Symmetry: C2
Subunit: 333 residues, 2 copies
């Protein structure tokens, strides 16, 4: 744990997060073993899942929020406690991915309960972090907001998929709550609250997180259709096969209805129903021909520009600002 | 909220719990509405589920633990905060029932996320209760223990059902963690910790909760086979139809293997696989003929006696002791 406590290192931070998560998971072993070997076996699977992949973007943003607020001075909280608070976000994400996997498709029984274990341990990892009572109290707004917002965002998303709903507005809401609040804005808010950040600083970070978080989901939607598996780690056009209700898809249908009824029909008939690479590609080319991809790219550009501008609105240490800009640019390109 | 703050009223307490839960649910409406109408619709369903049934046994035990420790004196915590801490247990239980319903059998998607919302709101209702920092800190052991124990207990139970496992010992473990820790011992512990209860008092309550909690599950197992639907609110022998891996069933198979291979075979072939009342009844009579029901009844008697005896081991206000005895007797008969 000898890293620079005043500077933001994007590339090495995930290593620190994995260390904190390792320590926490190790500490649960005896209690789990007192219950029984099959529970040890289930938690081993959760442990592998939590430790063995993830970009750690959410703890990274919490850490950046702490550094942005903590300025050139010393917060009185223990460094280890701050890092554990940041890292606890990985357990929320583990639950989200495990539960979303069941939703987008017993191992189902073990998965539901493993996800629930991850969610209770996210809370424990925060409450047992060693943050002071005062710091814990300051976490409430961001932590209460984040967890209601992400689950509320997922509920809205489930509805769109189940009702094959084509509202651009509703897809926007999903992006605001399921992604932007959850992934960027509230982690920044959490880290800044731990550091005792001012309302002005928190406001600037929350605006950045709102704009960059939406742009990040839009980029992710474009990659889920047009990106190479080498970049996405899923088969090409997975989002077509899965029937995701994206802003890209809503805009493609809006436009195709005006340009080619045959094309609009083929997209409607195909999304979330086709399987073969060939069928996926044909729907994808119909989407591209609508012009919707460029409209999404324009939104990403606009949001990236406005999110970055929000950082100039308050004083943030130079190095932290630089890294928040770099993180945004990597996230959205 | 004008009830007696020093006495335990078993019959009226659930009304108070419903009031606290109502207030909490009302307070989430605006935030949920800012996300979207379908999220309001999902939470409406969760609201009905939480408000419109439940015995409230867990908040009742938390309250009894508080009263047992608080003695003839005044805790400095606000009454409303204590009651909200007690009531937050209903959200844990809501998640447990919603998730267990999916496990024992999209509406599946909405159910998973509704359960997750209940679990995050259990935590919020506790952390936002207005308990002092000191009281919150005291809650950690009981609250950390309870949530890991109940999920760990459920994981072990899933394993027994999936592996059609017949260990009496493993069924015992499930009862200790999924029921006794979760339903009685840890709620008592939580309430006592809020009141600043001594280690001696907490020890007596935890022993009571361990013994009475196991006896309660054993009684529930007998009712799930031999009880009238008027008492259980499920069809007769539901536990046979569902294939529950009970201590009753493990002991019935242990014995039948020695008494009637034909009978042991019929029980093995039938549990969790038969459907008709007639088929259920035939398996049930095979179970009764083994003598296992009397062996379970003896265990209930023994545990009820030892759990009650634990209350005489420390000083508890007379009225609280009386009601803890009555609660145990109702729970286990």
């Amino acid at each position: 744990s000898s890293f620079d406590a005043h500077d933001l290192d994007l590339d090495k931070f995930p290593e620190v997060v994995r260390d904190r998560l390792t320590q926490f998971l190790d500490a649960q072993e005896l209690t789990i073993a007192d219950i029984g070997a099959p529970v040890t076996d289930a938690v081993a699977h959760l442990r592998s899942f939590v430790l063995n992949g993830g970009k750690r973007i959410r703890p990274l943003y919490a850490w950046a929020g702490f550094l942005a607020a903590q300025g050139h001075k010393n917060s009185s909280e223990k460094l280890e406690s701050v890092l554990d608070a940041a890292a606890s976000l990985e357990f929320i994400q583990a639950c989200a991915l495990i539960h979303d996997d069941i939703i987008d498709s017993f191992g189902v029984s073990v998965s539901i309960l493993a996800g629930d274990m991850a969610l209770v341990w996210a809370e424990d990892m925060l409450q047992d972090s060693g943050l002071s009572a005062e710091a814990l109290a300051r976490t409430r707004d961001a932590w209460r907001g984040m967890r209601t917002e992400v689950i509320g965002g997922q509920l809205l998303d489930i509805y769109l998929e189940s009702h094959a709903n084509e509202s651009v507005e509703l897809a926007d809401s999903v992006n605001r709550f399921k992604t932007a609040a959850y992934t960027i804005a509230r982690p920044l808010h959490l880290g800044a609250s731990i550091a005792g950040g001012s309302p002005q600083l928190i406001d600037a970070l929350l605006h950045y997180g709102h704009d960059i978080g939406i742009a990040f989901q839009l980029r992710d939607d474009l990659l889920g259709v047009f990106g190479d598996p080498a970049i996405t780690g899923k088969p090409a056009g997975d989002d077509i096969r899965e029937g995701k209700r994206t802003v890209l898809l809503a805009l493609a249908l809006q436009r195709a209805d005006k340009q080619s009824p045959e094309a609009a029909t083929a997209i409607r008939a195909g999304v979330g129903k086709v399987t073969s690479p060939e069928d996926i590609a044909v729907i994808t080319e119909h989407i591209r021909a609508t012009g919707a991809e460029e409209e999404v790219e324009q939104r990403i550009s606009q949001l990236t520009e406005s999110g970055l501008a929000h950082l100039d609105d308050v004083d943030i240490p130079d190095e932290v600002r630089a890294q928040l800009r770099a993180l945004a640019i990597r996230s959205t390109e």
